[PDB]
């Protein structure tokens, strides 16, 4: 019993002149893979930005293989973006931007949007001058993000509304 221990955890490794982003929210195979195809694309001109994934549940076998193929630029950490301790582990203040992904296959889009918005509040509470980009299910939930005092569109914060963009 003593020998067995968890494999995911620990503070993110620090590097000199290291630029990285934190991705939280819905972490699945066909959602992370599409983002990694464009962010780490073959033809993109040479800029090195690490990708940090912070999900509460450990990755499954389908997604574990994806992280193996991108071991040099993608690292996974088990935790919650809402926990201030886990925010320190992923080094939020060192991150260039924070990305929040939305669960497209959700029974209640309003409940998913509220949880996603509340994640932004936790990130903004930890660090005021952090750039946050969020996927939002419904257009009418954009007004809630405007209620956050630290949310500034000119600073770099932006909202990607799936319903508005897809049907647009």
């Amino acid at each position: 019993l003593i020998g067995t221990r968890a494999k995911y955890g620990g503070t993110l490794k620090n590097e000199k002149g290291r630029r990285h982003i934190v991705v939280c929210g819905h972490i699945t195979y066909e959602s992370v893979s599409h983002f990694l195809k464009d962010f780490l694309h073959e033809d993109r001109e040479d800029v090195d930005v690490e990708v940090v994934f912070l999900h509460r549940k450990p990755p499954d076998l389908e997604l574990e293989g994806l992280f193996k193929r991108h071991f040099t630029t993608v690292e996974f950490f088990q935790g919650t973006i809402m926990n201030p301790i886990d925010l320190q582990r992923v080094k939020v203040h060192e991150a260039d931007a924070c990305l929040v992904l939305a669960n497209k296959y959700c029974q209640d889009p309003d409940a998913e949007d509220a949880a996603n918005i509340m994640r932004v509040i936790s990130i903004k509470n930890y660090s005021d001058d952090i750039r946050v980009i969020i996927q939002l299910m419904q257009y009418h939930n954009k007004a809630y993000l405007l209620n956050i005092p630290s949310w500034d569109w000119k600073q770099g914060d932006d909202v990607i509304c799936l319903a508005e963009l897809k049907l647009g």
Partner: peptide, 22 residues
């Protein structure tokens, strides 16, 4: 990914597909 690298990318897209959303 496009939005992160260019902040103005989504501004142009929204101005072209929403018909004008002030």
């Amino acid at each position: 990914s496009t939005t992160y690298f260019n902040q103005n990318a989504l501004t142009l897209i929204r101005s072209l597909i929403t018909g004008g959303a002030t």
